[PDB]
Design a protein around this ligand. Sequence first.
Ligand SMILES: Nc1nc2c(ncn2[C@@H]2O[C@H](COP(=O)(O)OP(=O)(O)OP(=O)(O)O)[C@@H](O)[C@H]2O)c(=O)[nH]1
Ligand SMILES: Nc1ncnc2c1ncn2[C@@H]1O[C@H](COP(=O)(O)OP(=O)(O)OP(=O)(O)O)C[C@H]1O
Ligand SMILES: [Mg+2]
Ligand SMILES: [Zn+2]
Lengths: 422, 149, 99, 298, 50, 54, 125, 739
Amino acid sequence: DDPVVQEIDVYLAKSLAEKLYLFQYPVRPASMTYDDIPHLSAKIKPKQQKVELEMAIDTLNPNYCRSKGEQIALNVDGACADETSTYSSKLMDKQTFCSSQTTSNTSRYAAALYRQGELHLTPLHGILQLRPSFSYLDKADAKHREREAANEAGDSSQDEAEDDVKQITVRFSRPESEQARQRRVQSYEFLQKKHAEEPWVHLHYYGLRDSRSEHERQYLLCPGSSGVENTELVKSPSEYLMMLMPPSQPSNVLSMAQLRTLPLADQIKILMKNVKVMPFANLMSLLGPSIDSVAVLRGIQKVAMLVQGNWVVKSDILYPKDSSSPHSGVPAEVLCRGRDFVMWKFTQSRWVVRKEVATVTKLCAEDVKDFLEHMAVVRINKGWEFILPYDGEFIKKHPDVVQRQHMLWTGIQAKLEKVYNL
Amino acid sequence: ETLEALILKELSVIRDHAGSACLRELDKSNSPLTMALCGSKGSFINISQMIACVGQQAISGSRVPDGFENRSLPHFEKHSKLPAAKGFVANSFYSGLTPTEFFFHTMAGREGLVDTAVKTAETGYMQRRLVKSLEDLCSQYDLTVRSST
Amino acid sequence: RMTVGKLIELLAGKAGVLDGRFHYGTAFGGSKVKDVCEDLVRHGYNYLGKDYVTSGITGEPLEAYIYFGPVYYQKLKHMVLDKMHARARGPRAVLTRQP
Amino acid sequence: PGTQMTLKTFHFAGVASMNITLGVPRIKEIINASKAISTPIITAQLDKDDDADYARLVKGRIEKTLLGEISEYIEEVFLPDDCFILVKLSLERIRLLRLEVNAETVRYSICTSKLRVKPGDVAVHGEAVVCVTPRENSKSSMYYVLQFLKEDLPKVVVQGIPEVSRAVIHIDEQSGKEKYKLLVEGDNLRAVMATHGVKGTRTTSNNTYEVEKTLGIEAARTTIINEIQYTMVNHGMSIDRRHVMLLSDLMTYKGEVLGITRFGLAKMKESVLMLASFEKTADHLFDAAYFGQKDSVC
Amino acid sequence: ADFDGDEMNLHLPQTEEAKAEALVLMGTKANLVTPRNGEPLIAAIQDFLT
Amino acid sequence: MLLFCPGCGNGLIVEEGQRCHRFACNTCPYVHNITRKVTNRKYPKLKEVDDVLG
Amino acid sequence: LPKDVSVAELLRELSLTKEEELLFLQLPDTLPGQPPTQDIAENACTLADLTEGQVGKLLIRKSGRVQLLLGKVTLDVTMGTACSFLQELVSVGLGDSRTGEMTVLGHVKHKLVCSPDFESLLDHK
Amino acid sequence: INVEIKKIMKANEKVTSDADPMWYLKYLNIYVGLPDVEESFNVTRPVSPHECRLRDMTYSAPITVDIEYTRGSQRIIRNALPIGRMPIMLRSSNCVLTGKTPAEFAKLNECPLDPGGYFIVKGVEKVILIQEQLSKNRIIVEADRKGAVGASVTSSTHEKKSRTNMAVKQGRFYLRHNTLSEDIPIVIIFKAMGVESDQEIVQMIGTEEHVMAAFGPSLEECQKAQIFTQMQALKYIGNKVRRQRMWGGGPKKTKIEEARELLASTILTHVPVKEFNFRAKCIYTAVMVRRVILAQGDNKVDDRDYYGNKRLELAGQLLSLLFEDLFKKFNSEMKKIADQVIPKQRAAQFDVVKHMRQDQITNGMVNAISTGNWSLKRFKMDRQGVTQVLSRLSYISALGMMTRISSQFEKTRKVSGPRSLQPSQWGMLCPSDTPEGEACGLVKNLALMTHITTDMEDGPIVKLASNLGVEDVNLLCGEELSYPNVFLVFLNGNILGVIRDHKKLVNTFRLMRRAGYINEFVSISTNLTDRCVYISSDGGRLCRPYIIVKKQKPAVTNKHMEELAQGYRNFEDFLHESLVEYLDVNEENDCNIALYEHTINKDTTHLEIEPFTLLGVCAGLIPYPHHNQSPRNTYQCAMGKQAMGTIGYNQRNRIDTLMYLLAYPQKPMVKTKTIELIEFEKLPAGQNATVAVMSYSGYDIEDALVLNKASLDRGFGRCLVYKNAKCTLKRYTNQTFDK
RNA sequence: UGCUC
Ligand SMILES: Nc1nc2c(ncn2[C@@H]2O[C@H](COP(=O)(O)OP(=O)(O)OP(=O)(O)O)[C@@H](O)[C@H]2O)c(=O)[nH]1
Ligand SMILES: Nc1ncnc2c1ncn2[C@@H]1O[C@H](COP(=O)(O)OP(=O)(O)OP(=O)(O)O)C[C@H]1O
Ligand SMILES: [Mg+2]
Ligand SMILES: [Zn+2]
């Protein structure tokens, strides 16, 4: 699936980045538009965008009821007051559409204008949903309330001068508790008053049929060459993935990933502590080919010993100085001595007898069993055999390391003969 | 429901034919067969279930309902009305029951257990009421059953 | 009760004690009947557990073979000594003078 | 036997449908003598038990059929001169189900027993066409009260007993002859017996209250006995008929079927101590203290 | 009963009249049949039928 | 059936005007006269013939 | 009306006809770029920080795949929710602090959604 | 004790009194420390759990906190001031038993095989059973007593829990809430929540013909009234509102204000409103009405027994709630004492140090863990039987009682609806293990291989959902909700948005979770019947590990198993390498799992690790359970909890009110792998006897057995019963003592 | 509460 055709280019325009709004009518299908409806005005605020459109509707059309129009006009407004009237004439002539804010940030939304062979993207400064607002009914209810008050007052023909002098009812500006103050701030009335504090801005309407529409429609384009290498937008896939997903901030607790993040020495130490038996090639494969062999060799020579070409973790690594036998509680030094004796017996011969080790080291059966299971397997009629075969390749490749390990084992043998009196 | 009835009929046919074959092939002096013949304990159905083939696991007189969406267990396809996927047990107790078959058998067992648990209390209350209501009648010497009054 | 699992456990335990092994009764698996039957016939015992047995009372052999084998029985806390109860006149409650 | 009963299922009594409550719940409903029971069954015999056409005819006669179940389409037509709801009856389905219903019978069923529409508002414009013309009744009902009739008109009955909800044609396949009967899942025995073509002499019912109210107290006793015996036999366990006879007589010795609940027990018995011990201790004790009713030791 | 750990109660009457009534009316030999349908309950059981 | 006013979007009742029946909204003077026939069928499911079980 | 696809949409918009069309596409929160000298941090990079000119290409592969090559990475473009109500894209330019102009640019009919090809980003490294 | 306690302390870090301003008590950091005993005079001493068992005391650690306050307007700081005592769970992070070797366990007189995880209070071992409840913030469509198919939603936030219902009793949708005098039509609530046009409401409910036909009656009923604006609907709601028994304070015409507050905060608390913007809440109620309409036809009624909607609360959440309640009570008491002391005492400046009672929290915790009855007035939660006495009949008894789960139903009657064994319990709970009797079906046990998830941050989940093309719900109208290809994506009961081609979304989310960028415990499921994509990240959900299968071949090979056996890798490596992943009930509902390799077909997404893990701990002892009947396995599990045998290696030093030991216990010959896993062979509870199946002497008629006299004479079945007799010689108020 | 039946 190769890009056979339609290799369209994408351009970016910043001319109307702060002047582009998206108005959508959830109740008006796309078939019918407001191109023929003469608009009158549009109130708007720069901050806390909430636009209110005031349009005009026809009356002589057959789809308009003149009697109900007169009725609603008399209900919303007075008889002939006309100082603050929602409608100039005695009929419902003006219609109000109120805007609701969908989301606070609209940076991820952009308008795309498609021309032959190119697509121009322009950011949106705000997106609002326009719906037919019912505000004339609130004023109608207020007028009905004031008319009821007027009737209650005119219950009598001649109303005597009421001695209703406004006594001084100046209330305490009581210090409001922090909880009550927060409740007041979070109240809907406070937010509405704060929104109303911002002054309104009046704007005229220019329909799509106007020449100004086609005149300003060209600003969505940008003057530029067809082929231009963008200076930005050059991060690798890994960098993009790290950007769009930023981070939040037994002895085998550490996993492989956590292991690889540690220095080479710690990696080798933990690998020898967990496995306790592994060739050199397996260690090189697990650590990775990008690591030099000399470094891995120097690291493993400090926490391992050579037995029949294989590498066995040192005794002191498994049993720290402050540790003890989990079965008998003997000090870790005796466990280290016993494990060294077992490793020496394995280096001297491939077959090791459990009874002989138990008799020489004077240790219990469970400790010798644990020492043998770490580096040996039970073979019937033969005793205990080293788990891995004789690896002569590593011996032939590194004779100096072989000699170093041989002299170290000679020293360990001298120490064991001095201790156990072999 | 027609498909359900037909599948249940086919599974019951398999069950009864396997049971008949096991009864015909079994030789005399068989302790289970003898205990089923004399009626001391057990029956031919239990023998067929434990030797030849376990029957269809029926919950409330119907196949295993779909606990998950459109299927009893995720191990079967969606909208799959196959016998093995609705409660049927092809294997016997001797050969061993598969995980799904064992789960369906445990479902049937717990259903029976809860049924008996509810029955105990319900019949206890019914017996209490019936006895408290009927404890007054008695047979007189004139062959007329009269109340306390 | 159709407790064929008990018979399988008994056969597996017999085979294990004969060959000195611990058979596994893992759910939906474990040692099959054929392996234990082979182990039984190899040691000279019957391949079905049933063995020739003589009646201890009359001293005559039984007409039917008996199914012998090692079974893991576990004793429960329910004892007759703790459940045995007998009440004489004894004490009575203060509110209602009853036992 | 209640403990011996297993409360089984799948016992459709040979019809593979019409789930009926049997077992301990059924014995409970029987002994309680409740006026309304769950899943009432009525068995009716036919005069012509060998013909299926007559069986379906009597079924349609007894079974409740709504207007929406026989009409093929209902449409609100707002003509420029007037608005009204129109209903087109499917004569084909009518003759298939063998229902003796026509446009005039539908019009007569309208305006009666429901929706209060007057006869002058309903008209017949053809062989299978009916018209309904709502008006501004002024009882919070403007012309747009259409929206009520359009929701209620489809559920107006055109034929059958309102109480009857479902009736089926059961067949007994005796080797001598295959006969037909009606199994009605309703709670109206009088209407079923009064319908044409139904042998009212051999019609039984499961609801004891209806039998008591319709055919007397002895009929109720016989129905209770038969129902208890049948419910007990369904589970394979048998009881001597004398026990159920004594139970039914004790339930029907005051002329009215009184259940075993606290209400019937109080209506039957008179001892204050027994009523206080069974249920409603304080209430019964205070009532007796008020009435000063002396209780014997009988 | 099934002899699987069930605890049963044993009562001793304290009156000669009660003793005689228990022996006569509640006698095991006199209650070999149930009053429900007259079927005998006290009969052979497993290990006796076989 | 349910219809809405293009002006405000509220439900349209049917009322008898001075010349002909018309759809009208209860919160605005918008109206719409009926010119030709308008129908809204529902097609109820009928009763089916049920069978002779047994 | 059958559910159209982006590839056929663009094909019939360019081959079957030549009239321009206004589209409304939804870009991800962060673009694969860095704010150019915007005083920073690995923050969000939106279109408000990028400059004019060619920023990416739109490829239509076989089998109906529609991708957007916006540099080293490639997103995928799919059809968004099929909106049927009126959507008018207008330009509200406040030229003066007292009087501004509202310019109806056009109508919005189709909606696109651009998403990162997470599978490619994962199998890459 | 390491995270939640710090969050609770931070939530109430500052407490101050209204009188005498500029005075405050600020908490800085709280510590629990190691377990200690207050025996010594004003001195602490390390104490082992066995010593607490012997001395009939509690095994708790001192809860201290560093604080800073103002005595006389001069800031005084305390770095270490004990405030309470928290009972420390055994084998916990701060417990002395953790990180100890069997020899060190012997030095402390504790069994190494002891499961632990139970509290020791006043010498008794109490265990907090895992509580099971219904998932919160979820719509439930169910039939009412009269057969009406209505809906319910129990919105539960960190402060309030409110259950609001919706019924169709009279063909129209009425919404019922505990704060409304009478249920009101749903259209009035729609008009009150900002959306006043009926066309928009209908589009939000649905565009299907039957949907409009069913919703017509509600529109007509609303039209009959004069409610057409938001103000009128709010006034009607306020008229349908009742004061909470004369709330203190001047109302000042708060009818409409109270209505708006109840609509914004009280009703649907889980649905958040940015600033009195009910758009999300409007869409939520519209989707609920649509679900009710769709359910009013085909009877697709959701079931409560579906464990995919169940949540398990461990001891952690219960203890967190209890500690929060106790800390709030302590802060309130301190504020009251301050208000009572500071304004009238003397020029001697008052300080909280002289009034910080340290016995409050300790006594509260002790009573809550011992009695087991939890009464939280701040949440109005009155629970009983939360803690139970650990049964020491045998090792298996305790090991099985530690993994128990109780039901919210709190068995008191015969419901017979949750008692059934649901297929949703596959791999999570043991089907056979259940107490035989009245508690059958409602007291369950966990499976051998299972895990309970915790709570996540939910941040990266929302970020990835937003970056994957999820369109904002506020940007489009509700009409898009009626399209067949548009699927709703939720998040813990909250509408996250809409999406198209949900297959891509689910695949990418699963791949990202496998990669490691998303927490492996976040579950994603899809429901095509309702067309809803559920994203669950709350804690308490049951998850099970499964091997990922791709193209008829499992990801796990023999080489990986060899590496695991040799120690090159662990289970966490399998989790990171996209080899084994955790699946939830709701997630596995859409996935295809294979029992064995031979069962793997083309349409398979996962593979079963082991089938025998379906059983629990008690059921694991059954040798060859698939060859027996289910009641047999249930009775075997019931009696195994009462089986007689050794308890541990410290059973001789242990002194309990009743203990049963076996003279010569022997390990079984036919042992299940579960026995080796739980190390039951080290502490067997039975003996292997040469049983012969036959009838003898007719003394084995019904379930009875005949024993050999010589066998019993040679030690077979010999048992030991140990009882405890405790006496106390206490000192009374007067200077006299019991001698 | 746990159980026993
Ligand atoms: N350990 C124990 N717990 C009990 C006992 N009785 C009740 N409970 C617990 O308390 C809860 C029920 O309390 P009730 O039994 O109603 O207590 P009560 O009978 O009102 O108390 P009293 O009237 O004093 O006997 C259950 O959840 C049980 O766990 C008992 O005898 N021993
Ligand atoms: N709640 C109870 N009420 C009355 N009796 C009970 C109750 N629980 C147990 N029992 C006694 O125990 C007996 C129940 O045993 P039963 O149910 O017949 O066998 P079971 O327990 O199913 O054994 P299987 O599982 O068949 O091996 C009968 C009854 O006398
Ligand atoms: Mg018993
Ligand atoms: Zn209108």
